[model samples]
Target: PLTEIQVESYKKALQADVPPEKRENVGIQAAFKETFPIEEGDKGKGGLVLDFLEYRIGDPPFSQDECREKDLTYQAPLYARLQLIHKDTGLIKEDEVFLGHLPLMTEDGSFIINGADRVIVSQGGRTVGELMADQFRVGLARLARGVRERMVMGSPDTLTPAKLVNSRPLEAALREFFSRSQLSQF
Candidate 1:
């Protein structure tokens, strides 16, 4: 038989040599960094539109080590350059808006939440609409959303529907999400 490879060495071979970079959350950076397109409506007009032009992160109150020791949340203030328009009045306003905190990750891809080490796992599974099993559906749904925002926005509590989607059953958002999520295959 061939010599067996050690577990640690095998893991290293599959992974990177040094930490790739301290910065993280590329998908979200791209998602929130550009101006969003406005839907002109199928027939009529008069709606609200917001475009994210750029984003930035403010300095954190504590360093990684200090956060761990002081039990502080490891994060930085988040901001976005945005323009909000009212189609009815043709009012266009632009300014820098504060979103929330940017949750900074450690060198090894984990978060320091309440001084506890945690990680965001990817969603490899599938899903559907209209809901299904009632076994704590709300709980799991909320957790999944939290993780999605954490990975995308760095802050789990950021990106509320009221601020982005006008707080309604947004068909416009659904359509956009489908295409963006690559569900056109269906």
Candidate 2:
């Protein structure tokens, strides 16, 4: 089990790496593609292509306090400007459309849905240390140094700080953090 301190530290690292502003366009373009329709009676023909222009939220995200007070889910309508291209004709239609309202997860990686705080467990088996070392070389070096320093100092609560520093839970949390960042290749 991860202690509150560990979880908080992980959350801080994630926020620093991938803030809300950086996450705005993360999956918008990918999700928009499936909604485009293809030309009729043209089997295997190229479908309408969606060119993403801009993604916007309806309102500034609600603060945690405001969400509690209003008894509302912490979410905002996601809107985007897109250009639809006719596959064969090359004609284009541009319009702003409502995609959907996305729920905002807190810095701790929990979301408020239907006025209730909820946690979504990520599905993956990747290890953070390995991913960092392989993908984020510089950041991994820094993290390793910190862990080494903590291990050398020793912890009063645990007999071996290595157990704390190199734990799977810690790696999982860090992996999740990195996966959310723009730097993530995954």
Candidate 3:
């Protein structure tokens, strides 16, 4: 649980002495408080804190549902969960019971997996889109290798949970992109 002091500190941190144009958002501040336990005596403080992190991060609004529709396919359960975990933790490692190649949709309403032959075309930033696709391919390949290892070892419950094998590349990439992109210029 956060103490009153902690809550105040968090607010101050959000509203640090940056330029007004870069100053904090009250809505964001309110949302944070609403989604998190700002009071010291709150119950379910730990679980609530975790839920806040997940909500702030893995919100469905930011997911690739449109891609799923375009591809006309849904990813396997294990693969879907792995992608969520990757989105949350930004790790690229694979867990034997949790990782596998799943399907994905391209902007062009086509499906792609494994090799580049099946890559879908996009009118978006071609280089960036291709880079992201390549990263997904790398992640899927890692998961496939983990699955093979588990199969060879005759392990039970080959399907892994989202707790393990998230990707690491995304966090770095997003942070760098945010720092360098024109969107940050304003």
Candidate 4:
């Protein structure tokens, strides 16, 4: 719950802290550019390469009243222009593509999902550094299990801890027991 003054102050803070471009796209364009990079020999053979990929917010920002009237979610679709170049033949293909839509967050950092205001909540989770350490431990445990299996059962496939070993096989297996207990995808 927020008081009237608090709400007004928050709106003022948002207007002061965030720029117009950042508020509109929510920095998704920058994130997309960083994630998808154009490089040489990307598409296929014949020396095909990527010239450039640019994305921009297409539609105008919809107000809450507009959303309610049109029975639409508060979102703006992104449009992308991709250019591909062929080095051997000096050919180029440019096309405008629809990237996707993103929900527009309010000044209070809440989104209108299906015409309902929604707040994104962050949950506690393992950090990258912690996961890296756990990965090393799991790898060592896997190696130990493999060696033991080879010595006793003469095959790595027979390293089922359910039958022979009472201890947990790997740290990953213990952490994600249900996923590791099932048959592996590979």
Candidate 5:
């Protein structure tokens, strides 16, 4: 007997998406509290405290079928619970702030937008060889800085001993720099 399988089953099994409402819990609901925390304004005392308490996903006006037939997006109204407290005036305002519409996902894991269904697609993602190039490039700048630093101070003299400064050291540094990094040769 052949077990039932569909191309969409990859989404069903691999990603293992949760229920519709549960999906909102992890996605937008957490985003609500994550990005916007209890923020304080520049007002005096307790300051104007702004907080993102929670969020609500209201029901859509029409069914998915109706939305698809009418070329409309199947989405729900989104609201965030917010509170503003003013210590100067001793005032507090708490209300459900309407943000925007949240597109609802279907059982097959797709959002019907403008009557067209859309789904997520996996994409590709680099390495450390270039990191060595960056490191060596930085090292060259460091060595170059030291070369220029002493170049202005003094030069090799018979009367007094001092660090010498010239193009050989700088040229050697740049030569080795390019050799190791292999950046500008190309």
Candidate 6:
């Protein structure tokens, strides 16, 4: 959830219409830094596969899992995620990032951005939407730069630093998952 201060600042940003470069770079960076954890966690044992959509439907009225039963009212909108990979021998860092472009929706008209022991609802939850939107907007903005540069310069298919993961699917994924996971069903 976004703080009151963050909400106000984001509102100001929306109203200010700041240019891309002149916009709040620090805020953008901070948002990404904060979001990095969720992204990294998605790459945990089972390789979290997210459902990207606009809205989220609340979970079923009843579920076999106790955790789902406790929070049965909401589901999360699937946005971009930072898919991390654990590498042996320290050849590559343990973390990587990925983006989910589609909108995750639900039948109950509710969705959540799943966080560690926390869930962000979509409706009547301005803070959640704003915070997630901030990350998406900025991330897409960076992606746009890459696309533009590649098109203009006709650059080779080399991975840029910003695009740590790009769109490549993971190989030799370490697929292990514990019990009680929202994404496990998917």
Best-matching candidate per TM-score: 5
Q: Write the per-residue lDDT of candidate 5 for residues 1-186, one digit (tens) a residue.
A: 101222233223212234444443332333333444333443344444445566566777878899879988777775556665555566666777554454555555455677776543222111122222333334334433443344334321211111211224323543342234211111
Each prediction's TM-score versus the true structure: 0.45, 0.42, 0.26, 0.46, 0.49, 0.27
Tens digits of lDDT, candidate 2, 37-149: 22232324433344555556565367767775776777666555555555555666666654445455455555565555555443434332223323333333343344444
lDDT of the candidates, in the order given: 0.41, 0.42, 0.31, 0.41, 0.43, 0.32
Q: Give the RMSD in angstroms, all C-alphas superposed, for model 4.
A: 17.7
Error of 1 at 95 (Å): 2.9
Error of 5 at 80 (Å): 0.9
Model 6 agreement with the true structure over 1-186: per-residue lDDT tens digits:
334544354334232234434445343333443334322222233322111112112223333243244644222222233322232112222222333322222323223223213223334445533544454555544553443344234322332333443432111110111112234122
Candidate number that wins on TM-score, 1 or 6? 1
lDDT of 3 by residue, 157-179 (tens): 32233332333333343234322
Better of 3 and 4 by lDDT: 4
Q: What are the clashing pairs of model 2?
A: none
TM-score of 3: 0.26
Ordered by TM-score, highest first, the candidates read 5, 4, 1, 2, 6, 3
Q: After superposition, how far is residue 34 of candidate 2 from its true place, in Å?
A: 9.5
- Residue lDDT tens for model 1, 108-141: 4444666665543324232111111121123223
Error of 1 at 78 (Å): 2.2
Model 3 off-target regions past 4 Å? 1-126, 156-183
Top model number, lDDT: 5
Candidate 6: list runs displaced more than 4 Å.
Answer: 1-98, 101-116, 119-126, 155-186
At residue 60, give the lDDT of candidate 1: 65
Off by over 4 Å in 5: 1-25, 124-186
Candidates 2 and 6 compared: the better one by lDDT is: 2
